[model samples]
Every structure is written in structure tokens, then in C-alpha cells.
Target: RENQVYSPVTGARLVAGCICLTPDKKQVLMITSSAHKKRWIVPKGGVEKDEPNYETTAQRETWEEAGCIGKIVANLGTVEDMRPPKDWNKDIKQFENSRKDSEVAKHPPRTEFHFYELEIENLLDKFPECHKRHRKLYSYTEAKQNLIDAKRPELLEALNRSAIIKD
Candidate 1:
């Protein structure tokens, strides 16, 4: 049998991204955007109307959320996690019967998040006009720890499972 999960809300995959680390490996930039609980979350948004590649979505999300610019220096791979109920799609068809209308359920269509590393040189220069959503930079170690403690701890483990590529 296939493993599945559920949510209590409805919506679509709005965005997906990663926690970028500065060159020195001190700062980890995470975008602060509004979500189900309206708390701070890593940089993420929706894939464009005709986005062909999810990998590009990750890079694009990073630039949009933070002024950081860089290439995919590494791929920590992806993790499986279901968004909260509120984030599920409004269209019930988008979900499977496993998910109840009362509360969000993992359903059949599992959205996989692709994780990549962004090796940025300087934060300020890349996106000087960045919005408030891209407001803070946390310590890399702290950010990693926070992810490790998130609802999907397995995702964190996946992120750190691969060897970080060198510049």
C-alpha cells in the first residue's frame, strides 16, 4: 500500500523552496511569508503558469523571496510532506477521496518538493528592492535546527542527507 497523509483545508501547491546559506556558511536566508497559521516560513511561492521545470521554480522562489542570486551548487534531494488543510486546493477534484471535505487529507496527488542549494555571493546586491517578505537572515545552523524540528522532520533529514557540493 502507498503511504499517505491528510490536511484540514483546501488549496494547491503555491510554492516550494530551500534555505540558502551564504558563502561563509554563516547566514541562512529564509523568506517570511503568510501561510495557514500566518507565521514565518522559508521562501516559497507558486510555480508560474507555464513553468516547465520544478528545479527552476526553486531558484526563482529564492530570488523572489530574497535578493540572493546563485546557481544550484548542490541538490540535497526532496522530502515528502503534506501541506496543512488550509493549503489544499479549493477544487475537491485536486484531492483524492482519502482526504475528507471536513479536514484536509494527503489524498492521492502527493506534491513532491525538490530541494537544491543556492550559493549566493552577497544578499544585498542581488535584490536591493526585495520586499518585506524577504526580511531576515538566520544562522545556517539555527535554520537547519529549526527545520529539523519542523512538522516534517524527515524533510530536514533528507536535506542534510546529501553531501553539499563545493563551489
Candidate 2:
């Protein structure tokens, strides 16, 4: 089972994510959005049913999306999803049929995300989703503009909550 969870207010799926930062706290990692070419976001994904909790999901998602091994230092909490992930398999199938990306998202968009602050312990050149995502680290100040230009309000909130950026 995919372990997707639906939630309150108007019924939206739940997502888990990480605000991964360097141990020195000088930079934070960001990945190209699977749904958009010009925008980027923190590593995030749906939680599997068997995962211990959202924290585990956050760490696991970070490894797959950002290719970093790390430990959570703080919980950033829930935020609205500015953009959501695409169902790559369905997306590819649609492309096979039409030869262009589908006009609509293949996966149901999640409205909220649970984010945690993680300090990187080991960053790898190859990870489960490395071939699919562009992963990079940005200086604290630089990451701000990157998120702002990307119009990622949720990520901006997490970035602001992260201790990595300093006071």
C-alpha cells in the first residue's frame, strides 16, 4: 500500500518533508520540483503507512529527494503546500499517449506538509531519487531569494523556523 493519509477542514492528503541543512548551518538543500521547471523546494513526499511517524517520513523523503543522510534537530510543523508532486508513472504514461506532459497532475495534490529541520551528516552523490531530482545547497540568504522567487511560501516558513539560518 502507498500509505496515503487524508485530513481535516476540506479533506487533503498529508505530506512529510525535511528542511535539511548543513551541520555548520551555513546552507540548506533544495531540489527541483517534479511539477515545475523553474521552481524548487525542500525534499518532501507522502508518508507510507508502515512508517513509525512523520519524522521518519521526513528523514526518508530527504534521503530520496535530496540524497542526504541526516538527523532531525527540530520539527517545523505543518504548512500549506504551495505546489504538489506529480505521479511520475502516470505522467510518463500520459506523455507516451500524447507526447507531452499532462495538463493536470497525475497524483492528487496534498494541501498540507509536515516539515522537520534536519542537520546533514552525510551527503551522497547517488541516492534513490537522485536521477529524478536536482539537489543543491544554498547559502542561508541565497536560499531565501530562491524560495521567494519560486513562490514557495511553505518552504519559506520552514526556512524561517530553522535554526540553521541564525538570528
Candidate 3:
């Protein structure tokens, strides 16, 4: 544990993310995952020391990933991950076999994401992470199906937790 400050609530290396929705809550704004180029997912990242809280990290991630400026409407709570933080399937280059194995042996990374429902105010024409990610708005069902196809149960759980889509 160098300079990293984990989630204050859980005292773990948890992620903070957002489920961005339009004002009417009819459509959801999603971004393409860098790790899974073909997969569409919500904006999420780990907390930084500069961030005051999880909500701040959520907003920052949204802005960086989707060019979204918004306000958090509700806290949907935490979604535990089925894999490690440096997920082997996610990044090939970073998955340095020997080093990663040793690192994992020394100190493993846990994955848990705290998410919130964000009401998007403005989506900019040009924004950070635009070069790598594509952001688009989709119906709740379509978004849910995409998450399912991507095999992201955590995202599905968060999607279900939000008020955007109903059963």
C-alpha cells in the first residue's frame, strides 16, 4: 500500500462508476470498453486521492469516458466482481505472466464497484477518452442486452438497481 487510498466505506480497492441516463430516463448513455473493444459498458474507474468521495470519482469517470457532465440522482450501491482488478482477460499486455503472478501472490486486488444513477446535462462534441471510446445512447432493454452479451453481471446488476429500466 503505497499512496493508494481505497474506498472509505469498504476500505477496499473499490471502483466508482455511473449509470448515465437522459432527463426523461428513457435512454441510457454507455461507452465502449477499452479492455473489451467490442463491448459497450458504463463509465467506471478506481478512486483517486484528488477525489473527495465516490460520487466525485463517478462524475469524473463519466466525463472522461462519455464526455458527460451530470449530477448523480441516486446511489445504487456496490456490485462485487467475479474476477480480479487486473483481470487476465481484460488486458493482454498488462497481464505480464511472471510479474503479475508474483504481484498477485504478494498482494491480490479485489474488485467491487459502487455505482450511481447520473442525469446527464450535456454531452460534449470533444472530450477526454474520446479517441479510444465511443459513447452512445440506447434504450434500457438494448443496454441491458448489450451488458448480457458482454457477460458483465456486475453491470447488469447495477442496471437493474437503477430506476431507468423496469421489469
Instruction: For residues 7-33, write the lDDT of model 3, one tens digit per residue.
Output: 556456768999998998888898998
For model 3, where is the 10-residue window of minimal lDDT? 100-109
Angstrom error of the Cα, residue 38, model 2: value is 3.1
TM-score for candidate 3: 0.78
TM-scores, all candidates, are: 0.59, 0.77, 0.78
Any idea what lDDT model 3 has?
0.82
Q: Which is superior by TM-score, 1 or 2? A: 2
Candidate 1: tens digits of C-alpha lDDT, residues 59-78: 77777667767766777665
State residue 97's C-alpha deviation in candidate 3, in Å.
Answer: 30
Residue pairs in candidate 3 whose N, alpha carbon or C atoms collide under 3 angstroms:
none
Please report how far candidate 1 places residue 110 from its true position, in Å: 6.0
lDDT for position 123 in model 2: 91
Candidate 2 lDDT over 16-66, as tens digits, reads 898888888988999998778667778888877787789988888888888
Segments of candidate 2 deviating more than 4 angstroms: 1-3, 82-110
Best of the candidates, lDDT: 3
